[PDB]
Amino acid sequence: DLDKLLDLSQDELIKLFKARQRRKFQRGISKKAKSLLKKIRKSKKNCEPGEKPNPVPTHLRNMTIIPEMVGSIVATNVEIKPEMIGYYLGEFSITY
Amino acid sequence: QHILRILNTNVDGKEKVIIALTAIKGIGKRMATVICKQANVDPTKRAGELTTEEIDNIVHIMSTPTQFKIPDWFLNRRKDLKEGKNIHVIANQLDSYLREDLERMKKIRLHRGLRHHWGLRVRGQHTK
Amino acid sequence: PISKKRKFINDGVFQAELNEFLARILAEDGYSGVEVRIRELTSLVQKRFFLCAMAQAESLRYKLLKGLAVRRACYGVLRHIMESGAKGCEVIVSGKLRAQRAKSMKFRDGYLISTGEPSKRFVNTATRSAQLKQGVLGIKVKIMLPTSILPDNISVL
Amino acid sequence: RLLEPVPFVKTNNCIKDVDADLFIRSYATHLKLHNKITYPKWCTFVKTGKGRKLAPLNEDWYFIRASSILRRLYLHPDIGVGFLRRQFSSKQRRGVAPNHTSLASGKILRSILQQLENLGYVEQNPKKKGRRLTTKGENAINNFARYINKKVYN
Amino acid sequence: EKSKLAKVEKVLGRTGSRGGVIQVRAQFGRFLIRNVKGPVREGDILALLETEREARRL
Amino acid sequence: IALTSKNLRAIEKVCSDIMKGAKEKNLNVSGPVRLPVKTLRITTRKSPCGEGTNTWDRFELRIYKRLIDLYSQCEVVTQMTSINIDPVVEVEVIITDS
Amino acid sequence: DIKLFKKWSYEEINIADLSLVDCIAVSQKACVYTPHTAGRYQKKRFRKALCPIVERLVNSMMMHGRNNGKKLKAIRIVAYAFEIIHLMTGENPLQVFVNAVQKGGPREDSTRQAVDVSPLRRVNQAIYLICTGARNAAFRNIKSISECLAEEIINCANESSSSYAIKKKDEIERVAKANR
Amino acid sequence: KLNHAVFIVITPSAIAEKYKVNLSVARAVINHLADSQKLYT
Amino acid sequence: KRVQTFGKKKTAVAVATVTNGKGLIKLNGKNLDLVEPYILKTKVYEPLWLIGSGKLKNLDIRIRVKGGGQTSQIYAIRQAIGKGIISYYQKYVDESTKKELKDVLLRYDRSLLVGDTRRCEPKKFGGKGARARYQKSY
Amino acid sequence: VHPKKYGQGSRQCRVCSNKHAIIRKYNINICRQCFRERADIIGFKKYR
RNA sequence: UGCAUACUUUUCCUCCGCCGAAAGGCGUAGGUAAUCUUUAUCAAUAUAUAUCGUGAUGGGGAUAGAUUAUUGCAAUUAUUAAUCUUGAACGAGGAAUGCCUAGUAAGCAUGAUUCAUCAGAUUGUGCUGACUACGUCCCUGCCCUUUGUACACAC
RNA sequence: UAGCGGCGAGUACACUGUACUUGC
C-alpha cells in the first residue's frame, strides 16, 4: 500500500502515476517546489502526530501531491490522500 | 432456433451473429468484436444457430482475456490506479465497478466530483 | 541570405521608416528629392540601419498654425495652387473652427474627380495634422496633376 | 456485365493495361493459395486506420491491401509510407466536431512492405528514394498481367 | 378529359396579381383569347379546356 | 542572370537593354525565360473598432522574376547593368559556358 | 444510327399533342448515349426545352435531402429503371415515358381564376410531378428507387391510379374547372 | 417492425415482396436460384 | 507523321499527339475503357462513332491528362481529340474528308471542337457560399 | 520579470507597441491597425 | 543534477529508414523555395463490389469512466490526443424567420489567419452542375410628380 | 526550375511501337 509508495523512488513513482505526471516530473520540479518540499517535511517532522498539520503559505494551484509529504492541508479542508496524489492541488473559490 | 435467452436478453434470433454478440454488452462493438474473433465464430451465419458450446467459448474468452494476446492497452479500464489491475467486468459488474470508481471519486470530492453532484458536465457545458 | 518575399517586406518596411523620417524633417522646405544638412541625416540613418501637393499641404498647415485667418489663408493658398498649374484643387479643414460646434468646409474648383482607378492614378493626395489649444486640426488636400490625356477627353483637329 | 467493347488495338504489356480491382482480388487469391506471406498473427486485432474505427469484416484485408500496394508500387515506381497512407486515406468522425479526414495507421503498411522486401519483389536504393519493384518482380508480374489478360479475354 | 388544340400567333401582355398571367390569342375558332402561365414563345402550341370561354383583356 | 521587381515596366526595359546589348556584342546568349508570376496576398478588415458590418479587402504583390544567361565578361556585364538600371530592381548573376 | 445505351434509337414516336414533340426536343442533334448532358441550358427562353426530356428527368431526379447533385446515381438509377421497365413491360421504356409525359402534365392551373400552362411549363410540370411521386416513393418505402421509378413511369403512361403524377393532374384540373 | 424470415423475374425487391422476405435473404435466394445492385441477367 | 494539340474545359486539361501507327491510342498508361464510368466512356466513344475506326486504324493518338475531375478530364480529352483529328486530317492523312468531318461534328454539337469557359466564380464575403448572405437575426 | 519567448508577450508590433492584433504572415509583425494605412507606402496594393 | 563559460547550429515544412495501434519518438535527403514537403498529385461528395436491407436498428452519438504521448516552467477548470467502455434527442419540425436567378442554389470538402498547444470562427480554393421563371408591385423598403398638414430635435 | 521530342543503353509483348527505367 503506502510503504512501497513512501520507500520507492521517483521514476517508479511516475510509473505508478499517469503519463501526465510522468511528463511533468521529468520535465520540471524547480526550486519553488523543492523548497516547498523541504518546508513541508520540516513542518511534518516538528508538528505533533496527534494533531493534523498546518497548511502551506505562499499558496499555489500547480503543486503535485507526492506521498513523501503526507498530512498537509491547504488554506477547503480536503486532505491530500493516496487517491489524491495525481490530481494536483486546485482548491480555490468555487463557492455557490 | 430464434429467441434464446441469456443473462442479458438475446432476442436477436433473426439478427446477425456479430450484432447479436455485441448487443448483449460492450455496445461499443469492439470488445465484443475481439471476443468474437478469439472465440472464432464465423460471420456468414446468423444468430439462429448459435451453440451453447459457442456461448461457453465466449464466456471463457471473456474470463480474463489478459492470458490471450488481447493487449493491455486494448483492455478496457487499463490502469484504474490501485495495487492491482482491473479488466472489463461484463455489463452488470462493469456498472458495479463504475459505481466503485464513482464512490471513490465522491470521497475524492474535487472540483469535477462536486460539479457532477451539482448536476453538470465536466469540461463545461457552457450554459452561458 | 533572407528569402525574397521577406526581402520585399523589408524593402517596404524601410520605405515606411524613411517616409516617416522625411515627414518629420522636411518641414522647412518642400521636397528636394531623397538620397540613396546631409551629414547628420546620413550619419543617423547609417547608424540606425547598419505643384508639390504635400509641400503645399505642409505650407497650409504652417499658415494655419502660425496664427492667420482661415478664410484668407485658404484663399491665398488657392491662388497659389491655381497659379502653380493644376486644373483644380480641394482643401478640407477639420477642427474647432473657433467654436464648440464642430464644422467643416471644402474648397472645390475645376473638374476635381474623386473616385476610381484613373482618379487615384491622377490626383495626388495628402493629409496632415497639428495640435491646437483644445484638440487637433486635420488638413487634407487633393491636387490633380495636369493630364497621358484623361480617358474621357475627346478633341479632333 | 464487366467487359466492355474496346474498339482500338490493345497492347496488354503490363498491369497498367489491366484493371486495378480485378487484379488486386485475383492476386490476393494467388497469394492466399501460394502462402507467400503469413496472416500475420498480429494484423487481425487492430483497425487498418483510426478514421475507419470499425472492424475490417473481410478477413482478407492484409493480402488484398498488399496486392493493392504492389499495384501502386508499379503505378508510381517510387513510393513509401506517406504515399501508402495518402492512397489509403479515409475520413474520420471526431465526435461532435465535423467530418475531417486523416491518414490510416502506418504499421500495417510497414509490415506489408517488410514482407515484400523479405520476398524480394521490392528493393531499396539511395537513388529513386521511393520503393521500386525489382527486375524479377517486374518480369514475374508482367507475365502474370498477360496471364490474367488472356484468362479473362478469351 | 379532353382538350382543343391551339397555336400561338403572338404574346399579348403579361399581367395578373404578380405577373403570373399572359394574355394569348390562342386557338379553336380562330380568334380566341386565353391566359397562359410560364414561357410562351412565338410559334407554340397550346390546349384549350372549353371552346367558348373568354378572358378579360386589360 | 535573374531579374526581380514589383513592377513589370522596369523588367521590360532592363531586359530590352540586355537583349540589345547581347545583339550588339554578338554573344552566345540564352533566350527569354518567362516565369509564372508569383503573387503574395493578405486578408484585412476595415473598421479599426468593432462597430459595423464585416467588410474585408485583399492585397496583391505580383513580384516579377525572369532569368537569362550570356557568355560575356562579368565586369562588363555588371558595368552596363549598373549604368542602365534603377535600384528599384534586383539583379543576380549566373553564367554559362556552352 | 445513334442508339440510347447502344440500345434505343427510338425510330418511332407518337404524334403527341403537336407541341410535346417540339418541347421534349428529342432529335438526332439531341440523341445521347447516356444521361448527364453538361451543355448550355440557359441562353434563351427556348433553351430550357432544347434540353432533352430524358436529361430533364434525370437532372430533376436527385433532389432530396443529402442527395444534392448525386448525378452519377441519377444516371445509374435511371438506366436500371429503363431496364426494369423494359423487363416487366414489353413496351419500349422510351415510349412509355413519352406517354407518361404526354398524359401526366397538367394543362390549366389557378393562381388568382385560371391560366393555361405553356407547353414548356407542361413538360416541366410533368417532370416535377413525376419527381414528387418518386420522392414520396423513395421516402422510406422499402422498395428500391429504380423499381419505384418503374412503377411511377408505367402508371403515368397507362393513366393508372398508382401514379401520383396522374392523381395530382386530376387534382389540378378539378380545382381549375371548379374555380374558373 | 420486420416479420419475415429465410424459410419459405429474379430481381431482389420483387422476390422479397413475393415470398415476404428481406432483401438480404432475397439475394441469398437469388444466388441459390441462379447458381450492390446490377443490370438484370 | 506527328502533330500535337490541346483541349481545355473545366479545371482539367488534356494534351494530345497524333502519330502514324495502327490505332494505338493511350490515355497515359491505362486504356479509355478502364477509367471506370461507362457513362463517360460513351461520351469518349462518341468521336470514334462520328469519325470512323478504319481511318484511325493507321494513326496513334498520344494523349495525356493531368488534373481536374473525372467529368472535366473526359470533356478535356474529347476536345483535345477533336482538335487533334482535325489537325491531322488537315496535315497528313486525307484533306477532303475533313470538311465532312467538321460538318458532322458541328451539326451534332458545337461543344466538341471548343469547350465552355464556365469555371469557378471568386467568392465574396458576407456568407459561406459565394452567393449566400450571412443569416440576419432581427 | 518573468518573460517567455513564445506567445503574445514574446513579440509586439514594431510601431503600435501593443500585444493586440499582431500578424506574422511573411514576417511583417506589424499591427493591422497601422498596416491598413501603411499598405500604399510599403507596397501593398488592393486590386480585387 | 546546478551556475559561470568556449564550440556545431537547435529555432519551417518535412520525404525516407526505423521504434511505437496510434499518439508520438530516433537519425538523416531537400529547399531563403515551378528545383525539398508535393504537386506526373495532398481531401471529400462519390464511383464499383462485398457486411447490413428502414426494426429509434447495428443508425445517432449528448453522457461519463480508465489512460497513453506530445505542446507548454506551468493542461488542476479533466487544452490537444490514440485505445476501450458509455446510448440523450431524432417518425423531419407550431407562430414566426433567413438566403437565393448559373459552374451559381444546395451538398461535399479543402487552403490560410491568429499559433508554445487549439477551428466548431473569418477569409480564399476546389469537386458533384440541379427544380424554376427571364416578369409583377399584392407584401416589405426605398425614388419620383401632385396634393394636405396645427409636423420642423421633423408621427 | 515546364514540356514537346530524337536516339543512346535497356527491362517484357507484338512482329515485315508500346507499360516501365538512363543520359546528351
Side-chain angles (χ1 to χ4, degrees):
Chain A
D1 197 43
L2 304 200
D3 45 358
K4 58 185 180 181
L5 263 65
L6 194 40
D7 183 69
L8 192 52
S9 50
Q10 50 92 25
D11 202 359
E12 282 75 30
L13 183 63
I14 74 170
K15 169 172 55 183
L16 180 71
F17 284 40
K18 319 188 196 201
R20 198 58 203 186
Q21 291 94 14
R22 306 209 282 264
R23 195 194 191 284
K24 168 71 186 298
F25 305 160
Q26 294 157 233
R27 210 167 198 189
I29 309 102
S30 81
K31 182 185 178 296
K32 188 89 166 185
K34 74 196 280 186
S35 310
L36 284 164
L37 172 58
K38 294 182 182 181
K39 173 166 179 169
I40 197 169
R41 55 72 181 171
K42 188 208 71 172
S43 181
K44 267 55 165 164
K45 94 178 192 61
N46 291 111
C47 84
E48 319 174 76
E51 283 264 13
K52 302 188 186 180
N54 56 358
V56 176
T58 313
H59 192 268
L60 75 167
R61 289 196 70 191
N62 53 7
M63 183 278 288
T64 67
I65 307 142
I66 318 170
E68 55 210 353
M69 64 183 73
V70 291
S72 193
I73 64 170
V74 297
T76 58
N77 79 324
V78 64
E79 174 62 39
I80 49 170
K81 303 197 181 174
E83 60 203 15
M84 191 35 68
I85 50 183
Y87 292 147
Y88 285 68
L89 286 180
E91 312 154 281
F92 211 60
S93 171
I94 204 66
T95 310
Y96 182 76
Chain B
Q1 299 175 96
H2 294 52
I3 316 164
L4 314 161
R5 184 174 292 172
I6 321 173
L7 169 61
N8 197 355
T9 69
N10 199 344
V11 182
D12 291 331
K14 301 189 287 285
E15 185 43 56
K16 200 169 65 181
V17 54
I18 53 172
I19 297 89
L21 198 150
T22 67
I24 58 171
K25 67 186 177 295
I27 199 165
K29 303 282 175 182
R30 282 183 75 91
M31 211 85 58
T33 299
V34 73
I35 289 159
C36 174
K37 185 165 292 304
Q38 289 283 264
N40 198 55
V41 63
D42 61 273
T44 46
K45 78 181 201 174
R46 281 167 170 255
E49 197 143 349
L50 272 155
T51 66
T52 61
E53 209 177 295
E54 191 277 332
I55 295 167
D56 301 325
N57 192 359
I58 285 152
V59 72
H60 200 50
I61 292 298
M62 183 278 288
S63 302
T64 313
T66 59
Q67 291 103 26
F68 294 99
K69 186 264 183 183
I70 290 169
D72 214 0
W73 63 267
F74 212 83
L75 177 142
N76 177 58
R77 180 184 156 203
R78 300 181 174 131
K79 187 171 291 167
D80 204 37
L81 182 54
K82 64 172 58 54
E83 310 90 351
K85 186 178 289 293
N86 310 85
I87 198 163
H88 182 279
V89 287
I90 178 175
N92 62 355
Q93 192 43 234
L94 174 72
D95 307 327
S96 160
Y97 291 166
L98 189 150
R99 182 176 201 263
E100 292 283 333
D101 301 340
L102 196 150
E103 52 166 60
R104 281 199 291 101
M105 72 86 88
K106 298 288 94 176
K107 58 169 171 268
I108 278 163
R109 59 160 61 77
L110 276 191
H111 299 275
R112 58 174 284 274
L114 270 298
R115 199 92 70 86
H116 166 268
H117 164 249
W118 300 11
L120 310 162
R121 299 169 186 145
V122 178
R123 76 144 162 75
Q125 87 285 359
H126 286 75
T127 302
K128 158 57 145 58
Chain C
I2 308 303
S3 65
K4 303 196 310 300
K5 312 139 53 183
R6 275 149 71 186
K7 165 172 43 56
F8 279 103
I9 290 299
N10 296 290
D11 185 270
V13 162
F14 193 66
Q15 283 159 353
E17 314 295 330
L18 183 54
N19 274 13
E20 65 90 23
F21 175 62
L22 294 171
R24 298 272 160 152
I25 56 164
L26 308 186
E28 311 296 345
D29 192 1
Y31 288 154
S32 186
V34 298
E35 169 73 12
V36 187
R37 296 184 71 191
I38 57 166
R39 170 188 172 184
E40 307 88 6
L41 314 167
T42 305
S43 297
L44 278 158
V45 173
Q46 281 192 347
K47 280 279 171 286
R48 165 259 168 288
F49 193 59
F50 297 91
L51 264 179
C52 299
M54 281 215 278
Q56 287 309 109
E58 192 41 272
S59 197
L60 187 49
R61 191 265 280 170
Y62 166 86
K63 187 51 94 171
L64 265 293
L65 186 63
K66 301 315 165 299
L68 201 62
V70 176
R71 59 183 96 172
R72 189 265 181 274
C74 66
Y75 281 10
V77 167
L78 163 66
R79 295 175 190 269
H80 264 283
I81 285 153
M82 208 290 288
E83 89 169 9
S84 59
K87 303 172 185 276
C89 181
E90 161 56 34
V91 165
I92 191 66
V93 184
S94 297
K96 291 293 289 182
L97 188 153
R98 271 166 68 186
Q100 210 164 63
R101 187 71 268 168
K103 184 68 181 294
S104 162
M105 81 156 167
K106 279 214 171 162
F107 310 135
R108 73 158 295 275
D109 51 351
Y111 324 121
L112 205 67
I113 64 176
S114 60
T115 178
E117 172 260 331
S119 192
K120 178 52 215 67
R121 185 179 67 189
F122 269 100
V123 187
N124 185 357
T125 187
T127 176
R128 323 292 295 213
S129 190
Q131 190 163 2
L132 203 68
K133 43 164 70 167
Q134 201 182 4
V136 286
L137 290 191
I139 306 299
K140 177 152 201 198
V141 185
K142 303 182 191 167
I143 305 179
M144 71 165 38
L145 298 192
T147 195
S148 295
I149 60 171
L150 202 74
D152 181 57
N153 281 86
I154 302 178
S155 185
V156 167
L157 277 296
Chain D
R1 183 178 181 270
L2 312 178
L3 182 71
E4 160 87 351
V6 183
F8 62 91
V9 174
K10 290 176 172 166
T11 51
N12 290 121
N13 55 9
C14 176
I15 54 182
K16 266 210 168 192
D17 315 314
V18 71
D19 48 15
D21 298 2
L22 300 195
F23 170 88
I24 65 157
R25 67 183 198 89
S26 173
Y27 193 61
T29 300
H30 294 89
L31 202 66
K32 193 155 204 177
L33 192 143
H34 287 45
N35 192 243
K36 275 208 163 184
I37 60 170
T38 69
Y39 187 14
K41 64 94 174 180
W42 193 24
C43 179
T44 191
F45 323 110
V46 183
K47 68 195 70 177
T48 57
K50 277 73 68 178
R52 274 79 161 181
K53 196 71 170 169
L54 192 60
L57 209 69
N58 52 359
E59 307 313 307
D60 310 290
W61 72 88
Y62 199 75
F63 314 88
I64 289 177
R65 299 260 273 180
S67 179
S68 66
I69 284 172
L70 271 160
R71 200 71 181 76
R72 300 316 300 190
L73 281 154
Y74 189 95
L75 193 149
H76 206 274
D78 46 0
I79 57 155
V81 174
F83 180 91
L84 293 174
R85 294 189 77 176
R86 289 168 302 226
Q87 174 98 21
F88 300 140
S89 187
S90 177
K91 64 173 70 178
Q92 169 185 347
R93 302 187 80 151
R94 305 144 70 223
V96 70
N99 181 14
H100 278 94
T101 182
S102 177
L103 305 181
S105 310
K107 202 147 191 186
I108 61 170
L109 316 169
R110 171 138 35 79
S111 77
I112 289 172
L113 211 52
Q114 280 157 332
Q115 294 255 330
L116 297 165
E117 274 291 339
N118 265 312
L119 276 180
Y121 284 171
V122 60
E123 73 277 17
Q124 304 149 352
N125 276 109
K127 313 298 177 64
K128 281 299 174 295
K129 179 170 68 178
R131 292 290 190 282
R132 61 178 319 179
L133 193 67
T134 182
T135 299
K136 187 269 183 182
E138 285 269 320
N139 70 42
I141 201 64
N142 287 3
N143 207 7
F144 282 147
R146 288 194 197 85
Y147 167 49
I148 301 306
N149 262 316
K150 195 79 87 163
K151 184 181 179 181
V152 308
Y153 190 77
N154 297 326
Chain E
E1 286 269 7
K2 269 308 300 189
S3 296
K4 308 286 294 301
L5 189 138
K7 277 77 174 176
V8 170
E9 308 159 349
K10 194 91 162 183
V11 162
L12 282 71
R14 301 187 39 105
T15 44
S17 71
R18 293 176 179 88
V21 184
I22 296 90
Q23 287 79 50
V24 175
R25 296 292 298 274
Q27 243 244 274
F28 193 117
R30 235 206 66 278
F31 132 88
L32 209 65
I33 177 177
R34 290 289 86 192
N35 299 122
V36 74
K37 196 172 175 180
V40 173
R41 280 82 50 200
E42 168 164 39
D44 291 331
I45 303 99
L46 277 298
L48 306 174
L49 196 148
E50 268 173 66
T51 304
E52 215 62 35
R53 177 64 75 87
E54 271 75 13
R56 185 166 76 192
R57 174 72 270 176
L58 311 190
Chain F
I1 295 91
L3 187 66
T4 46
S5 285
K6 62 182 187 187
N7 64 338
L8 73 165
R9 282 308 311 241
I11 67 161
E12 288 291 328
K13 72 191 189 80
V14 175
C15 73
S16 297
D17 162 76
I18 299 299
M19 311 295 207
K20 297 290 101 175
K23 281 188 41 68
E24 168 167 50
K25 289 145 186 52
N26 51 251
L27 316 163
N28 186 2
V29 182
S30 194
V33 173
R34 302 195 182 273
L35 276 296
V37 290
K38 284 153 66 73
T39 178
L40 279 299
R41 318 201 310 135
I42 185 65
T43 77
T44 77
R45 179 182 175 182
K46 283 140 57 190
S47 80
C49 82
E51 194 271 350
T53 301
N54 313 315
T55 183
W56 295 58
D57 45 357
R58 277 81 65 195
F59 294 147
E60 292 187 16
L61 281 74
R62 276 95 170 276
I63 48 173
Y64 283 57
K65 176 177 165 182
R66 308 290 209 195
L67 191 85
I68 206 75
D69 206 351
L70 289 86
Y71 194 10
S72 179
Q73 163 44 10
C74 287
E75 201 169 312
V76 309
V77 301
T78 188
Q79 185 177 1
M80 72 205 158
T81 61
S82 196
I83 285 172
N84 282 123
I85 67 148
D86 192 342
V88 74
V89 186
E90 207 183 62
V91 190
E92 50 270 17
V93 62
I94 182 165
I95 203 173
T96 179
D97 184 72
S98 187
Chain G
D1 179 52
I2 190 167
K3 321 167 186 321
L4 177 84
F5 285 96
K6 329 280 166 192
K7 288 152 170 284
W8 308 112
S9 182
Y10 64 94
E11 299 294 87
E12 84 287 356
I13 294 180
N14 45 4
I15 55 171
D17 282 347
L18 207 66
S19 63
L20 306 186
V21 175
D22 189 21
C23 284
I24 70 179
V26 57
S27 195
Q28 318 313 312
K29 275 69 60 190
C31 292
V32 74
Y33 297 167
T34 47
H36 165 66
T37 56
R40 207 78 181 89
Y41 303 140
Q42 294 321 107
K43 172 57 182 184
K44 299 289 94 175
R45 200 74 77 85
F46 205 58
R47 213 72 178 187
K48 184 52 64 185
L50 197 68
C51 175
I53 175 66
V54 172
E55 295 298 325
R56 302 285 89 195
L57 165 67
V58 304
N59 290 26
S60 297
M61 271 326 278
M62 82 296 295
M63 201 55 107
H64 188 109
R66 321 289 88 201
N67 315 305
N68 310 116
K70 314 202 164 190
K71 292 202 164 71
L72 292 202
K73 270 191 176 183
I75 301 147
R76 172 177 63 80
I77 280 152
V78 301
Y80 192 52
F82 311 148
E83 311 325 303
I84 286 182
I85 280 168
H86 179 76
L87 291 151
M88 321 285 168
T89 50
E91 194 181 7
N92 192 334
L94 194 141
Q95 181 47 84
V96 162
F97 172 51
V98 172
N99 294 352
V101 65
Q102 67 85 29
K103 194 45 76 156
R107 313 170 292 187
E108 55 267 359
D109 313 330
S110 284
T111 73
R112 187 258 178 287
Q113 205 177 260
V115 292
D116 187 0
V117 175
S118 173
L120 170 57
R121 260 284 294 252
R122 193 191 185 198
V123 162
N124 293 338
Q125 273 174 347
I127 294 306
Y128 173 49
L129 284 154
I130 288 175
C131 286
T132 53
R135 275 69 172 269
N136 301 327
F139 195 70
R140 316 202 293 213
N141 297 123
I142 309 162
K143 285 194 156 285
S144 79
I145 171 166
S146 286
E147 207 166 89
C148 284
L149 294 175
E151 306 155 350
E152 291 293 327
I153 287 299
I154 201 68
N155 297 305
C156 191
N158 263 331
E159 210 188 55
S160 166
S161 298
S162 175
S163 178
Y164 183 75
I166 302 301
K167 176 172 79 180
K168 302 289 107 169
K169 160 207 174 60
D170 290 342
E171 177 77 29
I172 291 155
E173 288 186 354
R174 184 204 87 266
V175 166
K177 182 60 212 73
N179 201 6
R180 175 174 194 242
Chain H
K1 316 302 173 171
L2 73 164
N3 78 94
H4 304 159
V6 65
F7 191 73
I8 56 179
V9 185
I10 205 176
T11 80
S13 304
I15 288 186
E17 192 68 26
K18 273 173 178 291
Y19 291 168
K20 279 159 40 192
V21 291
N22 321 109
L23 293 175
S24 56
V25 288
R27 284 170 61 243
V29 166
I30 291 157
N31 303 341
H32 302 163
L33 197 151
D35 182 72
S36 70
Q37 281 189 34
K38 59 94 175 179
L39 280 77
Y40 196 68
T41 46
Chain I
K1 184 42 165 151
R2 191 148 200 148
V3 71
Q4 170 188 354
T5 52
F6 51 94
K8 303 151 302 190
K9 186 158 180 300
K10 313 197 71 164
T11 316
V13 69
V15 194
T17 286
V18 191
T19 60
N20 301 323
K22 216 87 161 192
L24 281 72
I25 308 100
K26 297 296 288 292
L27 182 144
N28 298 359
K30 266 163 271 182
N31 307 119
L32 298 146
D33 164 70
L34 315 179
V35 285
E36 294 270 327
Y38 43 92
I39 306 100
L40 296 155
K41 263 207 296 195
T42 59
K43 305 292 290 292
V44 167
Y45 163 72
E46 285 191 356
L48 195 148
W49 207 355
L50 260 66
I51 306 183
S53 54
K55 279 77 66 180
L56 183 49
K57 203 187 175 180
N58 302 93
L59 311 178
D60 290 353
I61 298 177
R62 285 157 149 269
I63 297 169
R64 318 168 190 97
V65 62
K66 166 201 175 182
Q70 47 270 23
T71 305
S72 67
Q73 83 204 50
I74 295 289
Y75 297 166
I77 184 183
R78 291 178 331 120
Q79 191 172 180
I81 64 188
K83 188 174 172 75
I85 192 66
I86 281 296
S87 170
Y88 212 88
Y89 269 87
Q90 178 68 41
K91 280 192 172 180
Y92 282 115
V93 297
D94 49 340
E95 309 292 328
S96 86
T97 310
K98 186 252 191 175
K99 52 186 179 70
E100 189 82 71
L101 170 71
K102 71 184 295 292
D103 187 271
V104 175
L105 288 177
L106 181 57
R107 288 175 63 189
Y108 276 73
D109 54 354
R110 197 158 167 226
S111 299
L112 276 173
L113 313 173
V114 175
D116 198 318
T117 174
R118 271 197 277 184
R119 304 257 177 73
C120 295
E121 202 263 329
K123 179 194 171 304
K124 287 149 221 175
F125 63 83
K128 285 213 169 186
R131 202 172 285 166
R133 191 178 187 273
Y134 278 139
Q135 190 142 286
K136 176 47 210 174
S137 57
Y138 289 118
Chain J
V1 297
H2 208 66
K4 278 74 69 178
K5 286 325 201 292
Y6 46 91
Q8 293 79 60
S10 53
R11 55 212 324 167
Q12 73 175 0
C13 166
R14 317 160 203 259
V15 62
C16 80
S17 80
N18 197 335
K19 299 170 186 174
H20 275 145
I22 295 173
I23 178 63
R24 295 157 78 189
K25 194 168 203 69
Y26 323 121
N27 220 358
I28 186 167
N29 322 305
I30 281 291
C31 74
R32 57 190 301 268
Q33 312 261 339
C34 287
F35 166 79
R36 281 178 58 253
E37 49 268 18
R38 279 150 171 76
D40 164 79
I41 59 171
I42 287 168
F44 287 70
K45 293 299 170 288
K46 49 194 308 282
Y47 294 144
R48 69 183 174 88

